[model samples]
Target: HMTELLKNHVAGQWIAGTGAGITLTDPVTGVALVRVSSEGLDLARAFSFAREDGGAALRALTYAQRAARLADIVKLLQAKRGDYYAIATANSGTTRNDSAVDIDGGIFTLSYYAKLGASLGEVHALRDGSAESLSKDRSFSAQHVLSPTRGVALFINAFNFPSWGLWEKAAPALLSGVPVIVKPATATAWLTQRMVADVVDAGILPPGALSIICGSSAGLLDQIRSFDVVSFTGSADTAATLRAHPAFVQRGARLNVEADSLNSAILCADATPDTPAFDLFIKEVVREMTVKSGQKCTAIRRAFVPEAALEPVLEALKAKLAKITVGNPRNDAVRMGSLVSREQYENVLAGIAALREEAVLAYDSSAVPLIDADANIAACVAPHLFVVNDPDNATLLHDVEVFGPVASVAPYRVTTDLPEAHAVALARRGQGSLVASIYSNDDAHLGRLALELADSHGRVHAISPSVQHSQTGHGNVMPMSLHGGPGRAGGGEALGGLRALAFYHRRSAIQAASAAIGTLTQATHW
Candidate 1:
């Protein structure tokens, strides 16, 4: 069941607008669920609502208090998660398992922030021992206090994992006493709207502490000022365009972009055709490709295999991918589902078309007959596998990402030379990446490659047979690790525990005279 009205959560209430409307459809059925618009929420009003109204109230609350409120909201959502799960399914078209992870996963983030605040203590104690002075009896002292940044936090979310994306961004910002204005992707704003409404209804957040924009945010970038933080998650092209905004550059607004880049997975050379490592490599690649239908920015876009094992690796992957059932997620027999929308499917197809220019299409699931054609109407079902025989021609393989269940394979010979050249190529692939995974039985080889690729990506998952079953997919769904990358990956970092929280809170070094610093901490001086 779907609702008619899609509104914004602002000033502690659910509000709708009369403007250019966008219809939200069920990705599994292609049925219109809701129409959302934001005609009245101009950029100026959004800015004022966050800064003038939300900012002051949020800033007034201590970090502990804010964290407690966040926890309260999480508990409320936990109780109503089933309701949200029902609504979320229509928009994300995720399986019950995927939907639960997306919905409850956000609640976990809020709980994490609450625990972080209590464990860290109220004021940061700068020193336990007094500083020695030249005088025989005098002792100097110092202390540090963390204060909220006096600016609004802006979040631009992506279409995939709408609930997790918004909460992952909002939880950290709100926990730090920073007001947030969310700009959800137009295609999946419905899910975001429902989650936000739950937050408002819980009455855990302060008035003006959160606001939502449902339609085009024209002139939004222009309103950004110094100390304001803007975090965007989407394509690198759009992130680059917004990052270069004149106001952001001149005013030095903190802008974070987590874009989709070409992430790679490397298979170690030591693992021959019959080795356990070779089996692990195949499993990792197939899992990365089919999980979430490869919509993940962290999905392995490129796989670097040893030249000696290339044929065997391809055969293994072909056999494994052949087993994946591409149909509706609800079907227990189906291992993978369709893309979020027809447009997304077409976009992946375009990338695949470009990839075919340099690589061979090893396998494609779209050609298989479907049991239910009507199910295909909700989302496009295409799972493709590509391989490049020549390692020298890595440009086409590394530069493009299909953004679906597709991965291009490249082969390498020497262990050292392979990782080195692959690292170089990966660095050149897209602007930056959120994550990269390396599979190898040789600990030494894996360690070396991990070090080399560390700087090029935000997180690197070093996988082997031992941890294969335990490894979370390329998309590190955990609340602790970061989710963004550099360059084409949008050059932004999100999640990563307190590091994510610091993004919302401005860090300015407060300097004072040594005597002044010492005197400020003294209890009583005669």
Candidate 2:
């Protein structure tokens, strides 16, 4: 395949890299498809333009106006959905279903925020809460207000979700009147660069409102100012490096990170092999494992079940795993695609090996037939399941995230009087996680675990027979809810309806006479 040069959009123009660039190859075919490099770009000027021209222009509009632009961008991308899907297959090796998880999911999140932002009307700043009297005479009072920060948002996205990871952060930042500069993972930067180009070329947004630099991010962080917000999605090791950057430590620039998470799914103690909870758990585990080839940070790395049902759960998982065929994403029959690159494939293999040391190999799909790829050359692999008898003492099971179609099933002592307590303890062994799911018919069991797990997980997904059919998948990160985690997961938050906008805004308490708020609110501008 002919390798096309991916350009960076910055300073109101489409600019290509100067020197020999980074080449991105097809994971399923090992064909070089895209080259990206930011070797000679002035990130200082780019960042300044974003804050001065882009941020000023965006903030000039009311919340409703900025939201309407988001809606229009969504329409622009929707028209070119087929083009994106093709690029996703060629670059990221994602099937139609997996592409939708990124492409369509990104569109939906933008649409969601557009509609949500419209409710704010033509307001420059939002009132946080009601005004409160400060003096005994009730003449003096204070009101809290949140207005857009006078800076830019830098989004460092992961390779797995080039589309969703970009927009989920951009939507809120744009709606909050902050300019955006996105740096997508170079290996899968094609889709992200194309999206930004389309939106920028459409002239729907002002110059510098949305820009993408599709190469090394060496100088990107160095341009960060104090008020700038940096949102990152990748491994915890890289996140630690970003967290310790001089921009954050000395300059006080804000940073939000969604790092590696060892998420889990727990079947309630009451659910037997034949119950709805049991069925739901099996279905979810299978779906999460195969979705995006289990490259998701939110995917289930741990499965906790009752000791009595361990055998049945393992059998059910293997039976379902056997049905999935891995190969080139262009093949419709292929259910799972290769990892983003051979490097990632090797990493997933290493992660599985680490887990294998302390766990028993329950199911290995290495011999599974490929649809249109060669295992020797193509970066393709099938699911690998393992069993850890004692999860409480297993360090790797709780620490390492395979980041592929690999999961470990562990049994908890359900014979205990309070089984939810035991399950919660085992789940917290991950330190902090993106999400932990509970499938149970008993509300008491669900409620107890959900609350207890809340301390460790950013999101607790509780499901039962009531909403089994309609429930969203466990690995899906909805724009309406929080999508980040704590501790090892980075202790950052994103996407919770209007709450996401907070990251792009600065809050201030306005102390004045009780009657001053109404005048300020009606001033028509910030």
Candidate 3:
């Protein structure tokens, strides 16, 4: 039933793969829903489809044209979004609320870029001001035109939020006039495959403008050319391996890696017992722990609380977490669902074991009960919380990531230490993160910490009393903010308006005499 609702959209058609297919299973229960295959999409065919056909057609369209098409696709998807959301919940193991966010939220991202094109205006001129006359009377002027990259774009999406992940990358690439070929993670390819099918049926995008590979893309990198760009979203190690591919290196492919890293939430030293700051810290940490079962790359994996308030903070987290309802996402009472699968559950357990080697388990989800165990056959129980007294002692705290609903709480005793010192120490822990947030009331202190975090994090949220309620959680935000970080955090950048678009398009600074520059850019001569 689910598979029939969705199919892979590739090369301007909704077609099923001819190769060996993998079963799409529901996360709550391991029941097979449909089989997905990419038999027809060999490495060579994928390469040509992306480079020759997709790239050529997309590059021919102006930015305005591409943006308009994206908007149209968004509208088309919105019309059929209820079915999309239904399918999304079956696989994601998320609440209707959460699934809606992933499904429709993706459509919103496409619309945002469509609107952004109008706001930002077209034909950005790189040069300004009139040139001086060399002879008795001379005419000269210069401007710049932004052009699309000549090659293909490879988008490697993660399992979670399949729709949002692929579209987030694809929308921006398309808006910039670059063709995209998406390779969805095997764990949840069905959702994306289905969404792609809808796009094809609508015929909103041009032929070769978008394509999909439901399975492995082993030799895909070997065919990359100079103007090509590769965007990967997964673990750091995988990104590193892909970045180092000989073909990518030889061709100088633009590689963007959004890796999973250890992101942290720091509570200001000034916060103490009975204070709003203290309460906010606990709430933020707990929210991060349970939301999407803490499977987010931007989830706060570490919490740095003042040493004096550590026990109380832990107690608060326990009290708050005890009330969470874990079960089938379809059940109205279920606040949280299962992990993506049993393997994902075991992976979280393994990380917990390693974390217990140096830290204490503060809360365990295994002790909890689901509201409806039989509904949808959900994967696992509720969230798990851990605490590390001495964070610096455990080398794993800085490097190892559990990747699920597991977070470590550490105490900071030194009140006199500058925020910069704390930021540097956290940075040294080495799990490069996409985002980091500091809870502080002091303006000066928050500003100082922001500067320190800038070097280690792609984005930093300065949380205070005023904005705590309004602040967007780590994963639920617009594209204006940078969404990836360095080292283990995948050492890549995405979203953030035009900064991300530039990644897919090669940027060359053209320098010449005012007259020559004007001639090349085809602007008016003064």
Candidate 4:
């Protein structure tokens, strides 16, 4: 009665996992998809395989050599891109637009990293900066160099993006000469499991270069050494638990967290209903809510508008959402799909109830006619829109993050208000967010306001008529930019080109004679 057996790839072989595995379901039809597990898998041996075999092989190669390997693997996967889309539509509830963002985005990320890694040169070792003269004489000097860590790269990912999340983290680590063991979210692990299976069958990577633990992390953190590199993507509460793990608090292990934060989009005082800024604000919020069914960590959860413009903004948002065709992602006409699972749908439903403390429902239709699908059988629900009260009070609009095709229209009056004190206070309700955006006509005043709010956000988008066309908006995380924020967003950085590669490496400072130091460094002479 099994739809499919999703096995963990570990220690160079495919092993049928033990124990009661998690059941996966198709979001569009609630059909049984596959069973996934990491139970009975050899965690210790898998670690050693990555650390010793994969790590050793990677360390032996130059940066340029590893970059070539990255290109090869991505290209191999790209050739089968159609296969990925099919699986994603069936299992992940992803539409064509979603695939273009995630699947296509994953391939594009690989190319970006490949080009960067190759341009950096063949030497495996990268110099941190200029060599400094430590002693009075120039004979003695100290230089900082970055080298790959002799450990495994543990990547615990969220279900929203199986391919993009895996490859974005893998490329930088692999290029830096560290092996990877991916622990994809159990709900959607089949896609990742299949990806790893394909990579293994191709024999493109070394024996221990890559592995996947499909089911539970099986408390994988407890088995890791202090030097291993670990990156996690999930809810803020889960992020706190992982950071508190003894390996981090006690053993000095490296943990990069990209927690799902309550991101915001501001409609500046300059913008009215007729302006382009007003139109851009409405478009971006709706796009964020519908894309991936608002499963994205970077999705805009809060829409801040001027108190006077709240009604018009709500009207525009409702109209735009009305145009979305929700149904099975397989349908060519469908623009919005279901959440990853029924559990996630229930979770967001609860969030809407919780938000009613200071908000009123604008559009509360969860059951509606969808294209090629029944809302009852499919996990499909209508996109929700909430109109929030209390622009001055920080509790309702700011703190809670409803993770679905849900958003709150909160009228923000921070400019004529207390300015930074009021602005920062409201944003603080999000605790910390991945990204924030300000739609304004005047570039100068908003730039200063953007700076004041910048401390609470990782990336702030100031979109005006002059440059809105050039902008990628707040929801899309690019391969070269910082994608993580400080507090609840998780104080970690991902896909930041060269800086990201540093996470896979250990930067060390060595003091020696200038001429002698030349041997320890790789063409790194200041």
Candidate with better lDDT, 1 vs 2: 2
Put down candidate 3 lDDT per residue, 182-294, tens digits, no spaces: 88988777778778877866778778888887765666788787878888888767877887897677777778878767887888776676766777777778777777788
lDDT (10s digit) by residue, model 4, range 161-240? 89889989998998888999999888877777777888888987788999888877756998788889899998888888
Where is model 3 more than 4 Å wrong at Cα?
A: 1-8, 13-15, 120-145, 374-377, 417-420, 513-526
lDDT of 2 by residue, 353-458 (tens): 8888899999888887788888887878789999999887887888888888999999998756467677788888888999999999776668776888998999
Output the lDDT of residue 337, model 2: 93
Clashes of 2: 0
lDDT value for candidate 4? 0.82
Q: List TM-score per model, in order.
A: 0.90, 0.98, 0.91, 0.95
TM-score, structure 3 vs. true = 0.91
Stretches > 4 Å off in candidate 1:
1-3, 11-13, 123-145, 415-431, 512-526
The residue-level lDDT of candidate 2 at 69 comes to 95
Model 4, poorest ten-residue lDDT window? 414-423
TM-score rank order: 2, 4, 3, 1
Cα misplacement distance, residue 281 of candidate 3 (Å): 1.5
lDDT of each model, Cα atoms only?
0.73, 0.88, 0.74, 0.82
lDDT of 3: 0.74
